[PDB]
Design a protein around this ligand. Structure first.
Ligand SMILES: CO[C@H](c1ccccc1)c1nc2cc(F)c(F)cc2n1[C@H](C(=O)N[C@H]1CC[C@H](O)CC1)C1CCCCC1
Lengths: 230, 12
């Protein structure tokens, strides 16, 4: 029902670490400022995604016990979660309140990014579904930590070690859902269900990127490592 | 081989 002093400590620590990210306004101001070509949008995305991976690795190393994990499992958790964490952060940003008509222009600008419309449709449906859950900053932060510390990733040698680190975060999130959303008792389950939908962005991620209407698909060395691109 | 991720994880 109520958070323990240790849980409040864990929550505030995750929040502090999560807030080191670029502010939503910094991202939306760039997109809303002017209409960019498909070529300019591709480079905006690679710069944003490169910054996201850097901030993600810093957030990940601060997660309690992450530094005690086997080094190869550490890489597996990062590569396994990077795309999902990016889309969860994009969903958070998309759902931030902006002046009247700005969210319509933001949506239209994203649809004009330069990628195939078959990749745009599930993106907006996921963003819309995240939006209806009216998640707090603490829920987005804990869910991001839970996504990173998923023991059910490919090439993980010691799944129990990861499971041990994920369990306290799941416990805090469940309590928060019971506190914040007491009228909706399926809220915690609702949030964990979203994580299964997040995983769908994985398989066709490289394809979505190579579909960008640009002459050259140049990615930064960091993006080549974390994503399945050359 | 993923030396950039390995670098960012092992730095500091
Ligand atoms: C995952 O990217 C999709 C995407 C859509 C369409 C095509 C490709 C990817 C996306 N969904 C967005 C929702 C927004 F509310 C938003 F403001 C920007 C959004 N972006 C791109 C972006 O900036 N993602 C950053 C990633 C790192 C984070 O730390 C910050 C967000 C994209 C939008 C179109 C112009 C180029 C950049």
């Amino acid at each position: 029902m109520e958070l323990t002093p240790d849980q409040q400590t864990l929550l505030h620590f995750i929040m502090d670490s999560y807030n080191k990210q670029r502010m939503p306004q910094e991202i939306t101001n760039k997109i809303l400022k002017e209409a960019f070509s498909a070529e300019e949008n591709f480079l905006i995305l690679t710069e944003m995604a490169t910054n996201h991976v850097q901030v993600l690795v810093e957030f990940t190393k601060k997660l309690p016990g992450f530094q005690t994990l086997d080094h190869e499992d550490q890489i597996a958790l990062l590569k396994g979660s990077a795309v999902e964490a990016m889309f969860l952060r994009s969903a958070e940003i998309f759902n931030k309140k902006l002046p009247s008509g700005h969210s319509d222009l933001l949506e239209a600008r994203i649809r004009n990014s330069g990628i195939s419309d078959e990749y745009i449709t599930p993106m907006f449906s996921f963003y819309k579904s995240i939006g209806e859950l009216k998640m707090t900053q603490e829920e987005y932060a804990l869910l991001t930590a839970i996504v990173i510390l998923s023991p059910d990733r490919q090439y993980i040698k010691d799944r129990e070690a990861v499971e041990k680190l994920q369990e306290p975060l799941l416990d805090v999130l469940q309590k928060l859902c019971k506190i914040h959303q007491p009228e909706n008792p399926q809220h915690f389950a609702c949030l964990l269900g979203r994580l299964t939908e997040l995983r769908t962005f994985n398989h066709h991620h490289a394809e979505m990127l190579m579909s960008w209407r640009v002459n050259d698909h140049k990615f930064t060395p960091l993006l080549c490592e974390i994503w399945d691109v050359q | 081989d993923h030396q950039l991720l390995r670098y960012l994880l092992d730095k500091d």
